[PDB]
């Protein structure tokens, strides 16, 4: 039989290994701030296209949290406009801000944004390993530090803020970034979807079909990537309100048939590609639109 020539190529698709936390909801670490335990994002890969929908609201989640005379419901999730102003900060403002730091000034924009957010000290607690997550916007080139690290409050019992993670069309240029986003995510993490490609398993010198797949309609690639994201690794279950940490285990992958408009979703790590011209290979981490 043939040895697997897909090994290096396929490494970035071992989401359990390279991301290692939830995707839909990422809360894979714990940390104390001022005598209080908190769950927080800890995923090592950027989540392309992810944001938060606030339910029963017109206000965007990148809006600063309510402060002063503002009520919690009129604000969003972002750091409030205090001075010196650390958020929102553009790429070039960040590059300038860190200009005398050889490492930080040369980081890619997503890692830079993540490291910038990571320099905020929560309640000025230096005993704390807690670090805020961030959202990077490709269009404006803005890093928004998130004050609220919660990603879902969907409990029908009283659904205060009701909200959910989503890949909305208006979030396409956004990337959700945990404190742990790695330097070399471009080499080790998914980004663009794969044309002329279908994820499979290497068996007896050949790429074989993923044996267990759930199939749903999806009119385009973006709809399929959304469905995969909805089923992906998650560190809290939907509508809730440790064994609650996914560690990147989940329905993280999808094979998209562009011709039959079928999204084929699975929870086992792929080890090769089948080259089928009807298919695009997508991941919950991947950009919702971009193809390679």
């Amino acid at each position, epitope marked *: 039989y043939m040895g697997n020539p897909w090994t290096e190529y396929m490494a970035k698709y071992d989401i359990e290994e390279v991301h290692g936390s939830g995707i839909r909801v990422d809360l894979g670490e714990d940390a104390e701030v001022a005598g209080t335990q908190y769950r927080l994002p800890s995923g090592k890969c950027p989540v392309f296209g992810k944001g938060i929908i606030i339910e029963n609201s017109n206000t965007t989640f990148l809006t600063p949290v309510a402060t002063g005379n503002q009520y919690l419901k009129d604000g969003g999730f972002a750091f409030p406009p205090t001075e010196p102003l650390m958020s929102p900060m553009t790429l070039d403002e960040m590059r300038h801000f860190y200009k*005398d*730091n050889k490492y930080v000034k040369n980081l890619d924009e997503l890692t830079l944004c993540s*490291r910038h957010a990571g320099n*905020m000290i929560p309640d000025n607690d*230096k005993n704390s390993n807690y670090k805020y997550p961030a959202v990077y916007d490709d269009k404006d080139k803005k890093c928004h530090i998130l004050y609220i690290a919660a990603q879902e409050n969907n409990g029908p019992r009283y659904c205060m803020f009701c909200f959910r993670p989503a890949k909305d069309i208006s979030f396409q240029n956004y990337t959700y970034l945990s404190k742990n986003v790695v330097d070399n995510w471009e080499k080790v993490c998914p980004r663009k979807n794969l044309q002329n490609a279908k994820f499979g398993l290497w068996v007896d010198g050949n790429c074989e079909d993923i044996p267990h797949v759930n199939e749903f309609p999806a009119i385009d690639l973006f709809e399929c990537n959304k469905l995969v994201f909805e089923l992906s690794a998650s560190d809290q279950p939907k509508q809730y309100e440790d064994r609650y940490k996914s560690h990147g285990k989940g329905y993280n992958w999808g094979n998209y048939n562009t011709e039959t408009q079928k999204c084929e979703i699975f929870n086992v790590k792929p080890t090769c590609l089948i080259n089928n011209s009807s298919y695009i290979a997508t991941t919950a981490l991947s950009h919702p639109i971009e193809v390679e």
Partner: antibody
Amino acid sequence: EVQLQQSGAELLRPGASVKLSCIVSGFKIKDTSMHWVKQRPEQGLEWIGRIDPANDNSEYDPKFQGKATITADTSSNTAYLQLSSLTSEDTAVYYCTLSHFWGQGTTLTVSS
Amino acid sequence: SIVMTQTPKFLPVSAGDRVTIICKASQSVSNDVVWYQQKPGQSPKLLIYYASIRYTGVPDRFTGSGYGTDFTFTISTVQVEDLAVYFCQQGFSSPRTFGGGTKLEINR
């Protein structure tokens, strides 16, 4: 929240010395250089020097060597400007900066 | 020591005129030039960095341009709020020397 706080106004006699402080809260300074700027009454801005809090690598305008000493401490997130051999020439507002963000300044008056 | 020669020292303008301030570097400072606004009694605030990039929140009337030695700062139409002293600074080499400043007078 991030805050910059400079020490209080200082009145001192000639020949003396002073340690000015620049306390940053809510932000780790190690990644960011910290600068001190001098402005004499009704005059222009003068760069004294800066410190790289990571290396403790500080540099100066040659005019201020042996007069100005800039230090930082990453565990307290605080920067300091030490001024030697005080003189009427040293009467000025002293700004500290967290990179490109400026403090409110400290007024130094040097007089007998 | 790189000298940054700021011109002019004093500039009277009517509310609506164009303001043009020039800063001449004695050596090449690439694009590493910042422009500051200091209003009476306040700390300088950064308006333009890397010679031509306007900081967020800074009004669109404020603009900077240039590369090498020749750097120019423009207020397209000066307003009453703009009464301040303006400074260039180079950050390309230490000492990071300031220009001598430009103090505006609002003509009326």
